[PDB]
């Protein structure tokens, strides 16, 4: 995954990273939130899911990251796939597990919608306010 189109004015925000992210995560996409200190963590923090994040390289705790709320992500595939080969399905909605921050096409009541795909490799990011269904039958 990579940021294709990012808008600094309300499309995303600067925040400090809460922990080190290793080069094993380089080019993966995760959903992220804010912890009680005001720093970025994978999954929901206290904020719920705040947005999505890609790092092109590993990064240290307390370094500044740009979290995307609205924009386009290219070379996209699910968080469990290999970056740059294991691309997504076309035309389908994508959902974050609020615990790990892992994104895949499987919907679930407790998950947060992050976007949908326009062709296999391009995700239109537009993160939901909250979970898919806060009142299951």
């Amino acid at each position: 995954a990579r940021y294709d189109k990012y808008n600094p004015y309300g499309g995303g925000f600067r925040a400090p990273l809460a922990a080190d992210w290793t080069d094993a995560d380089a080019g993966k996409l995760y959903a992220v939130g804010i912890n009680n200190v005001g720093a970025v963590v994978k999954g929901a923090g206290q904020s719920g899911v705040a947005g999505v994040l890609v790092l092109t390289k590993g990064a240290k705790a307390g370094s500044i990251v740009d979290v995307m709320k609205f924009g386009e992500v290219v070379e996209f595939g699910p968080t469990s796939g290999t970056p740059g080969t294991d691309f997504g399905a076309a035309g389908t909605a994508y959902y974050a597990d609020t615990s790990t921050g892992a994104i895949n096409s499987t919907s679930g009541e407790a998950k947060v919608k992050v976007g949908h795909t326009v062709g296999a490799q391009r995700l239109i990011v537009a993160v939901a306010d909250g979970v898919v269904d806060p009142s299951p039958a």
Partner: protein, 360 residues
């Protein structure tokens, strides 16, 4: 080879007919034979002088484009550079002439000049062997440059290095350029396969290049049979026609051209062990330099064949040394193919060209 000190008792003065041996030794004083000249000619076509002790072969990906709109902006494009790294080897080789004082007193002066002219022949024979084993010995080697180890390579050899994709033809780990014919005699199907195994990497006639093949005469007696649509060895069929050269061109680079199969020119090569063929690209856009790099020392004081003054000097024993130091590696790992003519199984390194198995 003879070896040892030259002694009184190795000296010959006059024939029973009264003819002096110094006049016989005077024949060998300046000549070079057609066999060493032929070996020197194989080196001269097959090699280039190395300028960088290590090379990088870089590549870049592709962009593409999108259709426009009244609103909205394109998807972003980038490319990432990558390379493979190829070093060239280097080693020192030494030779000595030794004399007793009475040998230098009484031996004919023409014999000393013949020994000097034979050192030049031994140098040519050494460079030829070291160029051939760079191709036919399909083992990997290591060289130290600035004190840091580098690999030096034969052709593609079943290794982890992946050939660069040419035109959407795309490759894997374990690619190869030493080939086993799968048959006791050469087929036209082997010649067609081997020339395509070069041409899949580029090195094409559209890329302006010419292919050449070097073969022992025993397999050229098969190629003369290859008339279009006719069966040849192992019940394969010639998908092109053999054309004899005039008298294709009668001669190339000063070598006796037999003819063509496909567009590849065929040349008779008596140095080749009988069960083998070399296919080699030439000219055009890729083969502006030859298959094997020759590396020599950075300092002009240490390049060339050199004489060192010896360390027993005048009486009762004399010696002197010749030295040359150089080495070899392949840059264009896809620019030539070695074909072995055998019925089944693993490729064999020719004993005459095993690295460390001998010299000259």
């Amino acid at each position: 080879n003879q070896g040892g000190y030259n002694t009184a008792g190795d000296i010959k003065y006059k024939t029973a007919d009264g003819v002096s041996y110094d006049s016989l030794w005077n024949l060998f004083s300046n000549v070079t034979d057609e066999w060493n000249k032929h070996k020197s000619k194989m080196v001269q076509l097959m090699t280039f002088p190395v300028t960088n002790q290590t090379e990088k072969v870089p590549r870049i990906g592709q962009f593409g484009f999108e259709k426009a709109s009244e609103f909205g902006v394109p998807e972003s494009k980038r490319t990432e550079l990558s390379f493979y790294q190829l070093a060239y080897d280097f080693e020192d080789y030494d030779l000595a002439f030794r004399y007793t004082w009475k040998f230098l007193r009484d031996a004919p002066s023409s014999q000393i000049k013949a020994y000097h002219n034979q050192a030049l022949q031994a140098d040519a024979k050494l460079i030829h062997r070291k160029v051939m084993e760079a191709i036919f010995d399909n083992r990997e080697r290591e060289a130290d440059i600035e004190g840091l180890p580098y690999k030096v390579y034969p052709l593609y050899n079943g290794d982890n290095m992946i050939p660069p994709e040419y035109n959407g033809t795309t490759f894997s780990t374990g690619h190869n350029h030493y080939l086993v014919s799968g048959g006791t005699k050469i087929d036209s199907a082997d010649v067609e396969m081997a020339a395509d195994h070069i041409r899949e990497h580029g090195y094409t006639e559209e890329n302006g290049t010419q292919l050449i093949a070097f073969a022992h005469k025993a397999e050229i007696q098969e190629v003369r049979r290859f008339r279009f649509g006719q069966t040849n060895n192992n019940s394969a069929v010639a998908n092109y026609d053999f054309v004899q050269s005039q008298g294709p061109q009668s001669m190339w680079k000063g070598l006796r051209v037999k003819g063509s199969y496909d567009d590849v020119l065929w040349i008779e090569e008596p140095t080749m062990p009988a069960g083998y063929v070399l296919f080699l690209a030439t000219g055009g856009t890729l083969a502006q330099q030859n298959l094997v790099g020759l590396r020599e020392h950075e300092d002009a004081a240490w390049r060339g064949l050199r004489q060192i003054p010896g360390n027993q000097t005048r009486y009762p024993l004399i010696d002197s040394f010749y030295q040359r130091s150089f080495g070899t590696g392949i840059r264009q790992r896809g620019g030539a193919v070695v074909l072995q003519i055998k019925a089944s199984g693993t490729y064999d390194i020719p004993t005459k060209w095993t690295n460390g198995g001998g010299f000259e």
